[PDB]
């Protein structure tokens, strides 16, 4: 195996745990640090040129954090669990004025993750895939990142066929949450740029840097 799912899962286990939009942002900034630790535990990531590592996490960070906190919320009803340990409910989200994007996270990601019982090996793999985004502008060698992306989804397909043989379209199912993830990522980014632009909200330094 050039890409064992086993190691992707340890990566996940390794990095593991009052205006709601201030809270979300504190969490985001905190988790940006946990993300860099996670990516380093992903096979071959650390071997890439420092430049491409930077491009990938600058490209992926938003989608990757959304994947984490969505899968972390599967047990939760009508709400998300932040890394801070603090739950945000949809009522709190509508009342800060982020109900639309919030609802989208619940219905398109959390609910779907709960309904199919997406395991942490699968979350890992999807996040690993999002990381190895060959579309990322500026990459020294896109072919290599394509080839790593290829190793991940091959491994996952076999993990699914083996672990959930009853569900022959589980693999496809998993891959068809990445579009929803892409949409929700960009809407979140549009929001974060506004919290910054407006200065309504404290933006801690690493999140700050990801928005510059």
């Amino acid at each position: 195996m050039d890409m064992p799912v086993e190691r992707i899962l340890e990566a996940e286990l390794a990095v593991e745990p009052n205006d709601p939009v201030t809270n979300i942002c504190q969490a985001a900034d905190k988790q940006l640090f946990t993300l860099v630790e996670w990516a380093k535990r992903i096979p071959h990531f650390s071997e890439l040129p420092l430049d491409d590592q930077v491009i990938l996490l600058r490209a992926g960070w938003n989608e990757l954090l959304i994947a984490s906190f969505s899968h972390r919320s599967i047990a939760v009803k009508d709400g998300i669990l932040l890394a801070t340990g603090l739950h945000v409910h949809r009522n709190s989200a509508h009342s800060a004025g982020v109900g639309a994007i919030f609802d989208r996270v619940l219905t398109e990601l959390v609910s779907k993750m709960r309904d199919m019982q997406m395991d942490k090996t699968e979350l890992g793999c999807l996040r690993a895939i999002v990381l190895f985004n060959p579309d990322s502008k500026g990459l020294s060698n896109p072919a290599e990142v394509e080839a790593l992306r290829e190793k991940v989804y091959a491994s996952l397909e076999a993990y699914c066929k083996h672990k959930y043989p009853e569900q022959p379209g589980r693999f496809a199912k998993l891959l068809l949450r990445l579009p929803a993830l892409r949409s929700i990522g960009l809407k979140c980014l549009e929001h974060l740029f506004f919290f910054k632009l407006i200065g309504d909200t404290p933006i801690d330094t690493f999140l700050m840097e990801m928005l510059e």
Binding site: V36, L50, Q53, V54, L57, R58, T205, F206, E209, M210
Partner: peptide, 13 residues
């Protein structure tokens, strides 16, 4: 230059 992102990525550990 992405100061913080770069400093987290160099450090072994």
């Amino acid at each position: 230059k992405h100061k913080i992102l770069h400093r987290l990525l160099q450090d072994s550990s």
